[PDB]
Amino acid sequence: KLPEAYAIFDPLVDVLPVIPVLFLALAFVWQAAVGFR
Amino acid sequence: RGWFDILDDWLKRDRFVFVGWSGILLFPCAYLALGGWLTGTTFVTSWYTHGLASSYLEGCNFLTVAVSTPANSMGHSLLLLWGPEAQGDFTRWCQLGGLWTFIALHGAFGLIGFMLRQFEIARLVGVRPYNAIAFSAPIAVFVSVFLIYPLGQSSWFFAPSFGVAAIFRFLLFFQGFHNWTLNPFHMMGVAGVLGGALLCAIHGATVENTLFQDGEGASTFRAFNPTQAEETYSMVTANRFWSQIFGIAFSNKRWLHFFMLFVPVTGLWMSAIGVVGLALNLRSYDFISQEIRAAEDPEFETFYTKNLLLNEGIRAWMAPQDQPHENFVFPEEVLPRGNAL
Amino acid sequence: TTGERPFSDIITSVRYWVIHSITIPALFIAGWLFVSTGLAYDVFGTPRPDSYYAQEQRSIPLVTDRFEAKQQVETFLEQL
Amino acid sequence: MTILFQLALAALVILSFVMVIGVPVAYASPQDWDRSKQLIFLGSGLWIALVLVVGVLNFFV
Amino acid sequence: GRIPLWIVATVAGMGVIVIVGLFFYGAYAGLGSSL
Amino acid sequence: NLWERFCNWVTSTDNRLYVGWFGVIMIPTLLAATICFVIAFIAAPPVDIDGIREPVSGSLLYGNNIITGAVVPSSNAIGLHFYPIWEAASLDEWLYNGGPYQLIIFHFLLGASCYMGRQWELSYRLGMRPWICVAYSAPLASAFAVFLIYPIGQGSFSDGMPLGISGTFNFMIVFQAEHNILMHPFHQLGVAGVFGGALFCAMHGSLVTSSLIRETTETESANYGYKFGQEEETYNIVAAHGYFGRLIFQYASFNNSRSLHFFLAAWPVVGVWFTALGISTMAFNLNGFNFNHSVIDAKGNVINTWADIINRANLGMEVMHERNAHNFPLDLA
Amino acid sequence: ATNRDQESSGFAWWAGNARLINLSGKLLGAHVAHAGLIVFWAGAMTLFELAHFIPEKPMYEQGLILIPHIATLGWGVGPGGEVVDTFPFFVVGVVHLISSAVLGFGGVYHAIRGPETLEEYSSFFGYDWKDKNKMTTILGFHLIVLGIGALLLVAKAMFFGGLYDTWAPGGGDVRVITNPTLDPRVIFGYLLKSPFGGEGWIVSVNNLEDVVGGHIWIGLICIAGGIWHILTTPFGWARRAFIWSGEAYLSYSLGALSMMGFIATCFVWFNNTVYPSEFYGPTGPEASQAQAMTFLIRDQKLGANVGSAQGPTGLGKYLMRSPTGEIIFGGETMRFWDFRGPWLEPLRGPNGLDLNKIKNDIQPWQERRAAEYMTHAPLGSLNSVGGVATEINSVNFVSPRSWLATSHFVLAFFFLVGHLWHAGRARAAAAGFEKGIDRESEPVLSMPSLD
Amino acid sequence: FEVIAQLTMIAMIGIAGPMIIFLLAVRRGNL
Amino acid sequence: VSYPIFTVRWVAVHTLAVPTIFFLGAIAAMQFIQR
Ligand code: CLA
Ligand code: CLA
Ligand code: CLA
Ligand code: CLA
Ligand code: CLA
Ligand SMILES: CC1=C(/C=C/C(C)=C/C=C/C(C)=C/C=C/C=C(C)/C=C/C=C(C)/C=C/C2=C(C)CCCC2(C)C)C(C)(C)CCC1
Ligand SMILES: CC1=C(/C=C/C(C)=C/C=C/C(C)=C/C=C/C=C(C)/C=C/C=C(C)/C=C/C2=C(C)CCCC2(C)C)C(C)(C)CCC1
Ligand SMILES: CC1=C(/C=C/C(C)=C/C=C/C(C)=C/C=C/C=C(C)/C=C/C=C(C)/C=C/C2=C(C)CCCC2(C)C)C(C)(C)CCC1
Ligand SMILES: CC1=C(/C=C/C(C)=C/C=C/C(C)=C/C=C/C=C(C)/C=C/C=C(C)/C=C/C2=C(C)CCCC2(C)C)C(C)(C)CCC1
Ligand code: OEX
Ligand SMILES: [Cl-]
Ligand SMILES: [Cl-]
Ligand SMILES: [Fe+2]
DSSP states (O other): OOOGGGGGGHHHHHHSTTHHHHHHHHHHHHHHHTTTO | OOHHHHHHHHHTOOOSSOOTTHHHHHHHHHHHHHHHHHHHHHHOOBTTTTSBOOSGGGTOOTTTOEEOOOOGGGTTOOOOTTSTTTTTOHHHHHHTTHHHHHHHHHHHHHHHHHHHHHHHHHHHHTOOOHHHHHHHHHHHHHIIIIIIHHHHSSSGGGSOOEEHHHHHHHHHHIIIIIOGGGOHHHHHHHHHHHHHHHHHHHHHHHHHHSBBOOSSOSSGGGGOOTTOOBOSBOHHHHHHHHHHHTSOOOOOHHHHHHHHHHHHHHHHHHHHHHHHHHHTTOOOOOOHHHHHHHHHOTTOOOHHHHHHHHHHHHHHHHHHHHOGGGTOOOOGGGSOOOSOO | OOSSOOHHHHHTBHHHHHHHHHHHHHHHHHHHHHHHTTHHHHHHOOOOTTSSSOTTOOOOOOOOOSTTHHHHHHHHHHTO | OHHHHHHHHHHHHHHHHHHHHHHHHHHHOGGGTTHHHHHHHHHHHHHHHHHHHHHHHHHTO | OBOOHHHHHHHHHHHHHHHHHHHHHHHHSSTTSOO | OHHHHHHHHHTOTTSSSOOHHHHHHHHHHHHHHHHHHHHHHHHOOOBOTTSSSOOBOOSGGGTOOTTTOEEOOOOTTTTTOOOOGGGSSSHHHHHHTTHHHHHHHHHHHHHHHHHHHHHHHHHHHTTOOSTHHHHHHHHHHHHHIIIIIHHHHHTOGGGSOOEEHHHHHHHHHHHHHHHOGGGOHHHHHHHHHHHHHHHHHHHHHHHHHHTBOOOSOSSSOGGGGOOTTOSBOSBOHHHHHHHHHHHSOGGGSOOOHHHHHHHHHHHHHHHHHHHHHHHHHHHTTEESOOOTTOOBOSSSOBOOOHHHHHHHHHHHHHHHTTTTSOOSSOOOO | OOSOSHHHHSOOGGGGGGGGTTOHHHHHHHHHHHHHHHHHHHHHHHHHHHHTOOTTSOGGGTTOSSHHHHHHTTSSBOGGGOBOOSHHHHHHHHHHHHHHHHHHHHHHIIIIISOSOSTTTOTTTOOOTTOHHHHHHHHHHHHHHHHHHHHHHHHHHHTSSOEEETTSTTSOEEEOOOSOOOOHHHHHHHHTSOSSTTTOGGGGOOSHHHHHHHHHHHHHHHHHHHHHHHHOOOOHHHHHHSOOSHHHHHHHHHHHHHHHHHHHHHHHHHOSTTTTHHHHOOOHHHHHHHHHHHHHHHHHHTTOOTTTOBOTTSSBSSEEEOTTSOEEEOSGGGGGTTOOOTTTGGGEETTEEOHHHHHHOOOHHHHHHHHHHHTTOSOEETTOOBSSTTOOTTOOOOOHHHHHHHHHHHHHHHHHHHHHHHHHHHHHHHHTOTTOBOSTTOGGGGSOOOO | OHHHHHHHHHHHHHHHHHHHHHHHHHTTOOO | OOOOSSOHHHHHHHHHHHHHHHHHHHHHHHTTOOO
């Protein structure tokens, strides 16, 4: 487990690893925002 | 001008989706086959025909859902909804495997409608009908596997069920009971399919790597215009490359593309012939000379004899649950096992 | 190029989403209620998790006759 | 001071979210680059200070 | 009255992702979870 | 200078078969593998593959036909140990323990890697774009997976694919028993790759053949309507596009020949990459999906699925394979 | 928008990063932002693993790939791999997360706000791919940094607490390495070993003294090579042997990384020294040997004579001979007789496994270890069902060795493919036909016919 | 309750990305 | 302009899309079924 004073932040930690994958997806969003020029 | 001619004009109108005369057969039958499969894999069980769960409603995932074949006691019944088994009751019709025959028959007539669509569109556009001729091989596969094979067997039960893991069961059944890998017609089918994949990859890569420079873009896809007259790639360079790498090379583009038609279509037709043979249990199960030698000589072992032992294991361990109508009770001591394990 | 409005022109319009922000959730909720009210079990004959077996049986109810199969399934269901 | 530490860490999370959204927006909108320059400089300084405060308060909680 | 096509594509793809993630969640929970 | 003349000859594009430096490695290794394969397939004595003094005969002279014949993989007692001829005390010992298999597969893998390099090299000498070797990397990865990576992960070259038809079938069946490859997504992607490759091969061939421009009469073959090296396209791309766009809808059809041929290259190559990676990842025993006893009723009874039927077939294969080689309950490798 | 479309750049959106080849500032931004991504994954994944970590359960039963790396360094573990403090894991995770915020800020700044080309701003930070001196200078800087990192591993092993030693006397323990092997014979004899069975090349390093001495050599060699490339220009043979362009350098790095990925796959699959079985689970060879040991112990307790017991084929059921004569475990695990593990070496004599020490010197901790390693073999399904493919759904286990080996084989193979792609493209672009064949000057048309 | 916090965190992160894109598009930024 | 609404394309799109959304709602509800 995390140290106890950080336990209230346990859900946020639970979603931290998937953030890099979103970065890849973000690139496509940005390209769609510029029409894939 | 006549109602037939006006209906013909409407059916052959340019649209997003072409309809045609063949559409009357194709779109209802194809739509009902697809909808029956989605409905069966979403909501319909196989508990009374196979003793299996096969729908999302029962907890199966995409790999394990299937529209299962009817029970073996149905025989080769068409299992019409209004027929003598279901007697108009939709719930009992679903519980008795009527969705399987629904999907199989509507899929067969939809495949007919799609090949007729290929013919009709080829006639309207003004091209030769080689795409329909090529599509004759999937039709032969579907007819031999889903119709001719269960018709030669005892019932619809031994046809493939319309599902992913059910098809995997069908593969393992053909290995264990038919020794289908040993069949030369299946070998020709494998050669056709793998050669078609090879030809697809090699022709695509060869064209992409012998392209002419027709633009300044470092991405070359924009350097092709569909109305252009010249070839987009160098046939001479490709021919010299494959003549020096492989020894032989195509020099005729028309022969190359006919060969691309010819290889997988011929493979699929050969495999369909083998499946007809297996419908009558006319298997290439064993080589008699090897079996006489192995019976008289307990030191003679080949990979083929090991495969036969594997087939014995498949049959004995699979049959009580795969064929529940037989009421097989194999005690633990009769099951063929190796040491330990 | 076939006399129909382009899909990109349709799905980017506000009238499309005025219609479909009603219709698409309505169909999704209709399917959800089709399952969650248990109607799908009644329509398609699919057993509930407590309806595969009787309380002290392990035999799978298998159809063994062709022209009495409907009655055999009814007899299976009468045995719970 | 568990409450103070949790407030400092929550403020770090909120400021990190604000910076994650605002730094690319301020960097990519060139017609705001006088005020947003100082906002980014203050947010970066405050973020570093909050990280140091959170570390020290971790050792005190 | 034009919603940008990139917004529609992003929202639809997020909906597809949510539905697929729900299906995998159900693969670990309830029926078909072996529990 | 003799070295300059030799370098000019090796890299010469005027040779009937291009050699190159990759070919300088490729020709001796593939010749050695080919000669040893032919000799072993005809005349090798039986090989104790499982290391349990149970020799398996794979050559034609020892009672095999073309279908059942194989070059049997080296002994399980050898494992991953390098076993050249000079490591054996005699040729009889080398033949008994399956040394020819190691010789053939090592020479073949080196020669096929150099075949890929040679494809790049000739494409470079001809002014071609270089990526035919990338397409060839998919069957080469498959060969590496079944001949090298799977023995490495399992710890013995005895578990490599035998060099024969029935030996290949034995490899497939035992692999399904131990790893459930049919339920592995990478093999499913490979099946999509090869089925789609055959489909798109038949599709592209029939669409080009369908739209051939009339250049010949009804008596002669249509293939004489194309002349080698001609500048004009021999078929109407627009007519084929119009047909295929009416067959499905306009935006499912390629109007760009370059995009179409890239798709033809890319679909089976990526699929075969994934299935070769599936064989390698199952070599490290990351198996296909296990849904055995996944569906459970309200009381707790197991409700079987098609995965349970597959499991019954896999169990039959598992308990019958290598029937004398196991002494302990778990087949850990 | 500078170089941000296909018309100006020549590259489509799906090759859009190729627009960055000659934009040194934006390329630096892409690299620094990606480095921030790597550090972010390290920190966030460590915190995720720690949040679900149960310290009494073994690490390899919990799907952990990063906590075993920290534990191998000696942080947070005691004797036998027992976790004594989870705080170093937390520190590593949070410091990586904060440093990734800093690196992400820098990457974003150089990608969208900083100067597009660094050459006008600084001759030191500006570069041209065709300038071989500048390329060797940057390579020298990075070689010095890598040498310092290897010396940091040495400093951790020798001064700041030591490393976990699975071969330590009396079970594995954190040990300070005080005599690293500086002999070049041992280090480069590891380099010259055969990669095949029984030899294992560099994967077979089986003591931490060799590991630390090898990293001393690696750090010194990297620092010396860095100074060498800072002070020297490429020679004539190097100038004629290579393509000197950004894509070419990328392809060289791709080939190097593909080879390193294959080596890491073999390292995590076979080596139990730098990947201790306390943290990563048993290896495949280890688990097969453990099963043979377990049933030898069980049947010897029942009164069997394990030396004279004869299996179905006539080989020894429990004990047989390797092809070079060593007494080894029988059955299929005869393939794994080169396995060495700290729970097995007390039973080994000069001629292999010793019958007397088998009969009299098997301790309860060895029986426990054999049973545990037998029942946690690196075999499992993609949905993490432990055991062989025919096993039922009750055990949720895939070994971290399996995850690491499979993932890094996939990555290594795809990076070999990328090396082939970029090496071919760099060669074709240097020669000038990467966009296709010139119609007017097609080379094959100027060649004689083959026949 | 814990999975609701997980879902709202991932919802805010995965909206924060497209929020950056949307803000740059409406402000005519250099996106 | 002056595009129609209810064409053959409309019918094909909705005969595929209406049951698709209905079935997706049904399967999403199935994810929350316990034994
Ligand atoms: C054109 C498309 C088409 C085609 C080819 C088929 C074909 C088929 N359907 Mg099908 N179906 C369709 C559309 C189609 N369907 C549609 C749109 C629906 C939705 C309503 C269905 C719903 C459906 C169900 C629910 C079932 C079928 C079934 C079947 C199969 C058996 C049908 C049968 O025996 O009756 C054949 C009937 C005819 C050939 C009609 C003959 C008409 C000619 C002109 C003769 C004239 C008759 C005369 C005027 C009236 C006589 C009066 C009196 C003397 C009786 C068959 C393969 C069954 C099945 O699959 O079993 C497993 C089944 O249960 N269908
Ligand atoms: C690791 C992934 C990665 C990275 C670092 C980059 C980086 C870059 N790409 Mg790129 N790209 C990628 C993946 C990546 N790409 C993928 C997968 C594709 C395929 C879809 C592309 C397709 C692509 C194209 C087509 C082009 C680029 C271009 C560029 C460069 C300029 C981008 C620009 O103008 O931003 C404009 C975008 C914005 C202003 C939107 C906001 C972006 C910011 C950075 C979001 C940051 C989010 C984050 C949470 C903020 C944290 C801040 C905090 C630390 C304080 C830049 C260096 C361009 C180029 O070469 O320029 C010459 C170009 O034309 N890329
Ligand atoms: C350090 C590694 C590295 C680097 C710096 C580059 C850099 C580059 N590559 Mg390269 N490449 C690499 C590795 C690398 N590559 C590997 C390993 C392969 C083998 C697969 C390739 C294969 C390759 C090809 C085939 C091509 C390039 C091209 C390029 C250039 C443009 C790339 C671009 O815009 O992509 C934009 C990014 C995308 C379009 C996104 C792709 C999405 C990937 C394929 C799927 C990832 C799935 C993910 C891992 C798991 C699922 C995630 C989930 C969310 C679904 C650029 C110079 C192009 C080129 O030659 O330009 C000159 C080109 O055509 N690369
Ligand atoms: C690969 C890393 C890298 C490289 C090569 C550069 C290069 C550059 N940056 Mg940049 N930067 C980076 C990372 C990097 N940056 C990061 C991570 C950030 C966020 C903090 C920034 C933020 C940043 C800003 C805000 C500015 C630059 C500027 C510059 C330019 C001039 C800098 C100068 O004169 O030296 C200055 C040298 C120093 C201050 C010495 C720093 C020594 C550090 C603190 C020691 C760190 C130890 C070790 C090396 C790193 C440990 C971390 C490691 C484990 C990853 C130059 C092109 C300027 C520019 O382009 O002007 C137009 C500018 O204004 N950078
Ligand atoms: C990231 C690491 C790195 C990189 C990319 C380079 C890059 C380079 N170095 Mg270099 N170098 C490095 C680290 C590095 N160095 C270090 C750490 C040292 C200190 C020992 C040196 C010392 C050094 C010297 C002394 C020289 C170079 C030279 C060169 C240049 C030509 C390279 C060449 O052709 O060799 C390619 C390799 C060969 C030609 C060797 C033959 C190939 C054999 C057969 C491969 C066999 C290995 C095989 C794969 C098996 C692996 C296991 C094996 C160990 C048993 C090039 C710019 C040369 C130069 O021009 O410098 C000015 C030069 O003379 N380097
Ligand atoms: C049988 C029957 C019938 C019919 C019905 C129908 C016709 C139905 C339909 C149905 C339908 C029609 C349905 C649908 C469904 C669908 C679905 C369910 C979908 C799904 C999907 C998904 C899930 C997706 C996926 C994907 C892919 C594939 C790839 C990429 C990714 C993604 C994710 C996107 C009638 C009454 C007439 C008569 C009687 C009988
Ligand atoms: C250029 C570009 C790009 C990219 C970008 C990138 C890649 C970036 C990166 C970025 C990054 C890389 C970032 C990072 C960030 C981070 C942060 C911001 C963090 C913070 C932290 C914190 C806040 C912490 C917290 C805590 C602690 C202290 C402990 C406990 C737990 C917790 C978590 C609570 C793209 C593709 C889009 C495209 C376009 C352009
Ligand atoms: C840490 C450690 C250690 C140590 C290590 C060492 C000391 C290492 C080193 C290593 C090394 C020292 C390596 C090397 C490598 C090399 C390479 C990898 C090479 C490459 C090459 C190439 C790539 C080439 C190419 C070419 C050719 C083929 C011809 C002409 C052209 C060219 C130039 C392109 C030990 C194991 C003891 C233990 C554990 C830890
Ligand atoms: C550490 C931390 C943090 C950080 C965070 C971050 C760094 C974030 C980022 C984030 C992001 C960065 C996000 C993004 C997202 C994205 C998304 C969600 C997307 C998706 C996509 C899609 C859906 C797509 C679609 C498409 C298109 C548009 C085109 C083509 C087609 C398709 C359909 C494919 C914070 C501050 C909270 C604080 C505390 C902790
Ligand atoms: O060698 Mn060929 O197969 Ca691989 O698992 Mn263990 O080892 Mn034997 O049993 Mn099952
Ligand atoms: Cl076998
Ligand atoms: Cl064994
Ligand atoms: Fe073609």
